[PDB]
Amino acid sequence: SIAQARKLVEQLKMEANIDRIKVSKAAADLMAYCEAHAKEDPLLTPVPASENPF
Amino acid sequence: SELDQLRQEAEQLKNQIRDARKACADATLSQITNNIDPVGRIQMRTRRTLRGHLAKIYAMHWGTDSRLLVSASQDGKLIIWDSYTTNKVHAIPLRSSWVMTCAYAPSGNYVACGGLDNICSIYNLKTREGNVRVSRELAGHTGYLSCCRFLDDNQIVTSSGDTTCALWDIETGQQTTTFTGHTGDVMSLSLAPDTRLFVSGACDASAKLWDVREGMCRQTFTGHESDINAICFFPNGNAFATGSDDATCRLFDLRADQELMTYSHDNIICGITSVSFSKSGRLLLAGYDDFNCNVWDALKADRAGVLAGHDNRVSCLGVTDDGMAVATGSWDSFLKIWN
Amino acid sequence: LSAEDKAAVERSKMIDRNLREDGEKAAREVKLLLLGAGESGKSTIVKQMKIIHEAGYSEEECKQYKAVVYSNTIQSIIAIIRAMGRLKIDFGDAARADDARQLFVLAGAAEEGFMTAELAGVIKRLWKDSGVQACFNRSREYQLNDSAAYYLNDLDRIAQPNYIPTQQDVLRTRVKTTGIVETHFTFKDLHFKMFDVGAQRSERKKWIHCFEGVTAIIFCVALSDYDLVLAEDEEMNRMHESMKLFDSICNNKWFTDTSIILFLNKKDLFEEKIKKSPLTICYPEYAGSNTYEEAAAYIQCQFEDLNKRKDTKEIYTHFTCATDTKNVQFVFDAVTDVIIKNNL
Numbered sequence: 001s002i003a004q005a006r007k008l009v010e011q012l013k014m015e016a017n018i019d020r021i022k023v024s025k026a027a028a029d030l031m032a033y034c035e036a037h038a039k040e041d042p043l044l045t046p047v048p049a050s051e052n053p054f
Numbered sequence: 055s056e057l058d059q060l061r062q063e064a065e066q067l068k069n070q071i072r073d074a075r076k077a078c079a080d081a082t083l084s085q086i087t088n089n090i091d092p093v094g095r096i097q098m099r100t101r102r103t104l105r106g107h108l109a110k111i112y113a114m115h116w117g118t119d120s121r122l123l124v125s126a127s128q129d130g131k132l133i134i135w136d137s138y139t140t141n142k143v144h145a146i147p148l149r150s151s152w153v154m155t156c157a158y159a160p161s162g163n164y165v166a167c168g169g170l171d172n173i174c175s176i177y178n179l180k181t182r183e184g185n186v187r188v189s190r191e192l193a194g195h196t197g198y199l200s201c202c203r204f205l206d207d208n209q210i211v212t213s214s215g216d217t218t219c220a221l222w223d224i225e226t227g228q229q230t231t232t233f234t235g236h237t238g239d240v241m242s243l244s245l246a247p248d249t250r251l252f253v254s255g256a257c258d259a260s261a262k263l264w265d266v267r268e269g270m271c272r273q274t275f276t277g278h279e280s281d282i283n284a285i286c287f288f289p290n291g292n293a294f295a296t297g298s299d300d301a302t303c304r305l306f307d308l309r310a311d312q313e314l315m316t317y318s319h320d321n322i323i324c325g326i327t328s329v330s331f332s333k334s335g336r337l338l339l340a341g342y343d344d345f346n347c348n349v350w351d352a353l354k355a356d357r358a359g360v361l362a363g364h365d366n367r368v369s370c371l372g373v374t375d376d377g378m379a380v381a382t383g384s385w386d387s388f389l390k391i392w393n
Numbered sequence: 394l395s396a397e398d399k400a401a402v403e404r405s406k407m408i409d410r411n412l413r414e415d416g417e418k419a420a421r422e423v424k425l426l427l428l429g430a431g432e433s434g435k436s437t438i439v440k441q442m443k444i445i446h447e448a449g450y451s452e453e454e455c456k457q458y459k460a461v462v463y464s465n466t467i468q469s470i471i472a473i474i475r476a477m478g479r480l481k482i483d484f485g486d487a488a489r490a491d492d493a494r495q496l497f498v499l500a501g502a503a504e505e506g507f508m509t510a511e512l513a514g515v516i517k518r519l520w521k522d523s524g525v526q527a528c529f530n531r532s533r534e535y536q537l538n539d540s541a542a543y544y545l546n547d548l549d550r551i552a553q554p555n556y557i558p559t560q561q562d563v564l565r566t567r568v569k570t571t572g573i574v575e576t577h578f579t580f581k582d583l584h585f586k587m588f589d590v591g592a593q594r595s596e597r598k599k600w601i602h603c604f605e606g607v608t609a610i611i612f613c614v615a616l617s618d619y620d621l622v623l624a625e626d627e628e629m630n631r632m633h634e635s636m637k638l639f640d641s642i643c644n645n646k647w648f649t650d651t652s653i654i655l656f657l658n659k660k661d662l663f664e665e666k667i668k669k670s671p672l673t674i675c676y677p678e679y680a681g682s683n684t685y686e687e688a689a690a691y692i693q694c695q696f697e698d699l700n701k702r703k704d705t706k707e708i709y710t711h712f713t714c715a716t717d718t719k720n721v722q723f724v725f726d727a728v729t730d731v732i733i734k735n736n737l
């Protein structure tokens with residue numbers, strides 16, 4: 001019991017004590033990463049259909 | 055008494071996590087994205103059809119060369135294909151046909167699979183003596199193997215219906231680390247871009263971030279009203295998508311430690327079996343029970359399109375490392391390469 | 394373009410050849426999936442198929458169960474002994490309380506089964522005791538192994554230095570397996586495939602659809618479970634759970650085109666138990682005479698009734714004693730015929 005509780009506690013501490021961020025920052029970065037590679041995405045950017053891969 | 059300290063300490067901890075998340079909820083992904091040029095609706099067509107399996111295909115994994123791929127079917131064979139020519143580079147006779155997953159190694163030397171046997175079987179493609187026979191069988195799991203991914207020829211992580219994930223040392227066959235925590239079948243797992251940590255989806259409707267080297271669960275993501283069958287990391291490694299029985303797909307941010315978006319549409323209440331990201335992270339591809347693969351805008355949350363070409367459900371998905379193509383496996387026994 | 398890379402094309406064709414041949418062989422084989430609660434007989438039926446239709450067990454394969462036999466033997470005596478406390482039963486001879494303590498001292502933790510000159514006597518002394526016997530009779534009031542008396546009575550043969558398990562011993566072993574068990578066998582011209590997911594301790598819902606379209610399901614039911622409960626919920630009667638499971642598998646959308654075959658197993662245990670205990674512990678609305686004939690029929694009618702597509706699917710019930718190779722032979726050989734006829 002005291003042992004399991006402790007085991008739980010240290011895990012909750014692990015989940016608890018971390019460098020969180022706000023959603024607007026986190027979200028911006030996603031838009032960022034995406035908009036940054038939007039052209040390199042062959043499924044977004046219909047690569048010159050001639051004979052490339054398929 | 056002493057148990058109260060711990061109990062009381064436990065209670066407060068959950069709330070700080072609760073309140074901590076709450077506090078960061080200063081905006082929504084949708085809000086900040088509401089002002090973006092929509093993906094529009096892009097059309098994809100089947101460029102290649104891979105026939106050779108008899109039974110339902112349960113998984114497939116693209117080789118890092120974005121050309122050769124493995125597919126596992128319960129017809130007892132792992133077929134390794136030449137996505138370009140459609141030639142079968144291989145067909146591995148499985149010691150057990152109740153295969154639920156297969157994994158193509160980053161190096162291209164090995165491949166793996168396992169299932170109702172609770173074993174992860176490591177097949178060396180380079181058997182100079184000729185062809186393939188099981189090189190390693192990783193036993194330890196007491197529930198089906200739901201997913202497996204090599205970090206490299208030397209190590210592979212596995213998820214299981216026994217509620218755990220595990221890291222193994224192929225060379226020796228010993229279970230390196232057991233990732234306990236989930237209280238339901240772990241159905242899927244995804245390796246972060248660097249193979250430093252990974253996330254796992256489970257039947258307790260929760261995802262979990264695990265530190266491979268620490269063998270501990272960092273964070274735990276909830277939000278799904280049902281099992282999680284598929285899981286995938288956003289290309290940058292700071293977010294991941296989950297596919298669930300509850301008819302929805304969800305993006306969760308690691309740094310903001312919480313769900314950011316939900317991808318769903320009325321007139322779609324069947325489960326998702328697989329999720330994959332487009333090379334840029336813009337599109338989220340989810341394989342559905344209704345034979346279709348739905349493509350969503352990972353930022354706006356709308357359906358960019360839908361890949362229809364399978365007669366039974368889409369069981370596994372896969373977008374090449376170079377983002378050049380998508381593979382969709384199915385219970386109908388065919389695989390399709392979409393572009 | 395158009396060259397010697399075509400060597401891959403001929404190899405791919407070689408593979409298709411192998412796949413195709415291997416594939417043809419797979420459409421004319423019979424696939425059977427065994428289901429039912431744990432302890433219902435699935436494992437035994439699987440093993441039977443190997444004794445009847447394949448090599449059966451060899452001295453070597455049998456000696457490899459020597460450990461499991463010793464473990465089951467020890468596990469049984471301990472469970473009965475412990476059971477005396479719960480139910481407050483004295484030893485017939487007080488000097489057994491020592492052997493009881495010695496039983497746990499000797500019978501250490503898991504390694505394998507021990508079986509020593511000393512443990513053998515300790516056990517032989519305990520089993521034989523009138524008190525242990527008294528409790529053993531009240532084995533309906535606690536979790537107890539089916540093959541307990543089997544192994545305990547034969548302790549003189551088992552505890553021998555030059556012991557080798559008989560196939561019966563093997564058949565009686567309870568080794569709990571987590572990995573799906575499969576046994577292939579050729580019989581009556583066609584090939585067979587029997588699968589026992591066994592204790593695939595994972596939600597059934599995730600792998601059930603894997604067997605959609607199996608030729609037939611053989612659903613085992615332990616008839617002797619009617620007067621037993623669940624050591625976790627207490628109120629939950631085991632026979633009732635088996636029914637819920639059956640209802641779930643019988644009418645399961647994945648098995649619509651599958652032949653359901655109940656194996657009302659443990660009829661030999663049921664026959665002796667029905668004399669002592671009433672069916673009314675299980676089915677309180679049972680007004681029938683508490684005999685084998687009538688009660689066994691009542692139970693059969695209760696499971697077959699769970700079937701909702703009664704107009705579309707026929708439930709081929711059979712009363713078995715999975716540990717009796719002859720009985721299983723005939724019953725299976727009768728299952729094989731219905732199957733042949735019914736479908737193929």
Ligand SMILES: Nc1nc2c(ncn2[C@@H]2O[C@H](COP(=O)(O)OP(=O)(O)O)[C@@H](O)[C@H]2O)c(=O)[nH]1
Pocket residue numbers: 429430431432433434435436437438538539540564565566567568613658659660661662713714715716
């Ligand atoms: N007397 C008797 N023992 C049986 C019968 N069927 C199985 N057994 C035993 O009851 C126990 C449970 O059987 P098992 O095959 O392990 O059930 P499973 O859990 O479904 O695989 C084992 O000791 C078997 O040998 C039966 O009809 N009669």
